[PDB]
Amino acid sequence: RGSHMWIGVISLFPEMFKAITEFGVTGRAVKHNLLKVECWNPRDFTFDKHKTVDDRPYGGGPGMLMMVQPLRDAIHTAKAAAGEGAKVIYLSPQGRKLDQGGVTELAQNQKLILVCGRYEGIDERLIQTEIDEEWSIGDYVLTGGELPAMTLIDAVARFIPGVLGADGLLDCPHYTRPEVLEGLTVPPVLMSGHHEEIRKWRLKQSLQRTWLRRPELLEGLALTDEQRKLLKEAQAEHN
Amino acid sequence: RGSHMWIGVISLFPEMFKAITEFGVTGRAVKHNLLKVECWNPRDFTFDKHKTVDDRPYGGGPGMLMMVQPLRDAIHTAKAAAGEGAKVIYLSPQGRKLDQGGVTELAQNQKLILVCGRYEGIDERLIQTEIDEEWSIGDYVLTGGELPAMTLIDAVARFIPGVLGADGLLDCPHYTRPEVLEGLTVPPVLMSGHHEEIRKWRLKQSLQRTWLRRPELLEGLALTDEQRKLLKEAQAEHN
Ligand SMILES: NC(=O)c1ccc(N)nc1
Ligand SMILES: NC(=O)c1ccc(N)nc1
C-alpha cells in the first residue's frame, strides 16, 4: 500500500519469523500487504555436503562465528532483490541502542535488510563491507539476532499507516470492567464523562509515574506549562 | 535437569513461542528438559459465544484493554500449576529496564510466570493484585508483550547450565576465514598463536570500542590495572 514497508531478513532460522508474520497486528499487516518480510537462509548458499554455516575464529577462543561465504552470498542476494535504497542493519549488543526515537528514524526507510547473527557473531570485515548500521535492542545478550530483528520489525510496523486501528512519558494506568476488583475501585474521574478532567488526570498520572520510575526521562523533555503544573501538583501530593 | 528453569506464559498467541521452543540453542534446551515453557491462553478461559478477550477502558480513549476475567483466570491457573515460589512478571514499557545484570537476577528464579499484554495493556488493579514485577526490554513500544517475553526467556536461558556449549564491556571484533576479504586482512596478532598477546589485544579492542561507542558504560566500571593501561594505550593511539 501507500507507505508499504519491505524488510529483507538474513537468518539461519527463518521459521522464527512466523511469530510476527502469522499473528496479531503484524500478521494482519503482512496479510494486507502493508508489510512484506522476505527471508534468506545462509544454509541455502552453502556448497559442501553437510551445509556448513559456521567457522572457527582466528586467534582461538571457545565459540564459532558465522561462516563468511554463505552469509555474504545470502546478503548479496537480499540486496539484489531489494534494489536501490535498502539500508542494511546488523543486530548486536555493540550497536546503537534502540529507543522510540530510533524506531521513528528506522521507520522512514521504505526498505530494510536485517542480518541476524548466530554463534559468536559475524566477521568484522563483513560489518565493514556489507553493513550500513549496527543496532542493539538493549544491553543484554541473546542466542541470536532473530528476536532483536523481530522486535525491530514489530516496532517500526506500528508506524506504517493502516497497521494500527509516546510524548516522552510513561503511559498512565488503565482500567476496564469490573468497577470494583478485589476491593480496588476505578478512579471516579474516569467514570465522570468529563473529557477534559480525564485528559488532565491521565497526563498527571503519566508525569507522576515517569517522575517516580524513570526520572531521567523527564530531564530530556521541555515540559509544557500545563505539564509543569500537573507535575508540580503530583510531586506536592506525593510529599 | 540441575538448574532446570520453568517458565509459564500467559498469551493470546501461544504459537509465537515456537520461535524459541522449536529452534536453535533454546529449542535444544527445551528438547533436553533444561527449559520448560508452558503457555495458557486467556481465550480458553472465556465463556461467551465469541470468546471475547478485550474490553473497553473506563474514561474512553481509542484503544481496548485485555478483558479482566479471562486474563485473571489464566493467571490463576498458571500460578496453581507453578506451585510455590514462582515470580509473576508483566512485560511493559513502564517496567524496570532489562539489562544483563537484571537478566542474571531473573535467572536466579527456578520458576517464572510471564504475562503478555495485547491491545493497550492490562487493568492497573491486576498489576497491583497479580503481578510481582514489571519489566521492560527497552524504551520502545511493541504490539504485544510476546516478543519481550521471548527475549527475556532467551536471555535467562543462557544462564542455565548445559544450555550453552560480558564483564561490562562491548565485545571485541572477531575474524574467520578467509585471511583476506575484500582487501581487508586479519590482524596478524590473531594469527600469531601467542595466546597472551591475543588476550590483551581482544581486551584492548573491547575497551576501545566501549570508550568510542558507549563511554557511559565505562563510568560504571572499576577497571583493573591492566584494563586502565590498555585503555590509556588505545586512547593515545586514537589521538
Ligand atoms: N542486544 C541485542 O540487540 C542483541 C543482538 C544479537 C544478540 N545475539 N544478542 C543481543
Ligand atoms: N518495551 C517493552 O518491554 C514492551 C512490552 C510490551 C509492549 N507492548 N511494548 C513494549
Concatenated DSSP letters of B27-87: HHHHHTTSEEEEEE-GGGG--STT---EEPPTT--S--EE-HHHHHHHHHHHHHHH-TTPE
Q: Which of A158, A234, A169, A1 is nearest to B63 (CA)?
A: A158
C-beta separation of B170 from B209 below 8 A = yes
Residue with cell 481509542: B62
CA dist., res. B77 & res. A68, Å (int): 48
Q: Where in chain B is the domain with CATH 1.10.1270.20?
A: 166-239
> How crowded is the C-beta side of B118, counted as CA atoms within 13 Å?
20
> How crowded is the C-beta side of B100, counted as CA atoms within 13 Å?
13
- Measured CA to CA in angstroms, residue A19 lies from A26, B36, B207 at distances of 9, 19, 37
Q: Give the strand pairing for B5-10 and B35-40.
A: parallel
Q: Where in chain A is the domain with CATH 3.40.1280.10?
A: 1-165
- Length in residues, chain A: 239
C-beta separation of B125 from B166 below 8 A = no
C-beta separation of A234 from A211 below 8 A = yes
Q: Which of A191, A142, A112 is nearest to B56 (CA)?
A: A191
End-to-end distance of chain A based on CA atoms, in angstroms? 52
CA dist., res. B178 & res. A72, Å (int): 12
Compute, in angstroms, the gap from residue A2 CA to the centroid of ligand 1: 31
C-beta separation of B183 from B140 below 8 A = no
A-proximal residues of B, 199-218, CB under 8 Å:
201-202, 209, 213, 217
CA dist., res. B205 & res. B170, Å (int): 9
- Residue A155 to residue B177, Cβ atoms within 8 A: no
> How crowded is the C-beta side of B239, counted as CA atoms within 13 Å?
6
C-beta separation of A9 from A88 below 8 A = no
Geometric angle at alpha carbon B29, from B169 and B140, rounded to 5°? 50
- Look up residue B107 and give its three cell numbers: 535467572
C-beta separation of B57 from B64 below 8 A = yes
- A181-199 burial: b if 16+ Cβ within 10 Å, else e: beeeebbeebeeeeeeebe
CA dist., res. A114 & res. A125, Å (int): 17
SS3 state of residue B147: helix
Q: What are phi and psi for residue A89, nearest 5 degrees? A: -120, 135
C-beta separation of A106 from A133 below 8 A = no
| CATH class belonging to B166-239 | mainly alpha
B132 touches chain A (CB under 8 A): no
C-beta separation of A171 from A217 below 8 A = no
Q: Which class for B229: exposed (0-12), middle (13-18), buried (19 or more C-beta within 10 A)?
A: middle
The residue to mutate among A116, A135, A136, having the most atoms of ligand 1 within 8 angstroms of its beta carbon, is A136
Task: Given CATH 1.20.1250.20, say whether it is the number of domain B1-165.
Answer: no
- Method of determination? X-ray
Resolution in A: 1.9
Interface mutation vs chain A, best among B9, B69, B140, most A CBs within 10 Å:
B140
Query: For ligand 2, atom 8, which residue shows the shortest CA distance?
Result: B144
Q: Which of B39, B114, B110, B164 is nearest to A141 (CA)?
A: B164
**Three-class SS string for B86-111?**
CEEEEEEEEEEECCHHHHHHHCCCCE
Q: Which of A42, A88, A92 is nearest to A67 (CA)?
A: A42
CA dist., res. A5 & res. A109, Å (int): 8
- SS3 helix, strand, coil % of chain A, rounded to 5? 45, 15, 40
Is A144 near ligand 1, meaning CB less than 6 Å away? Answer: yes
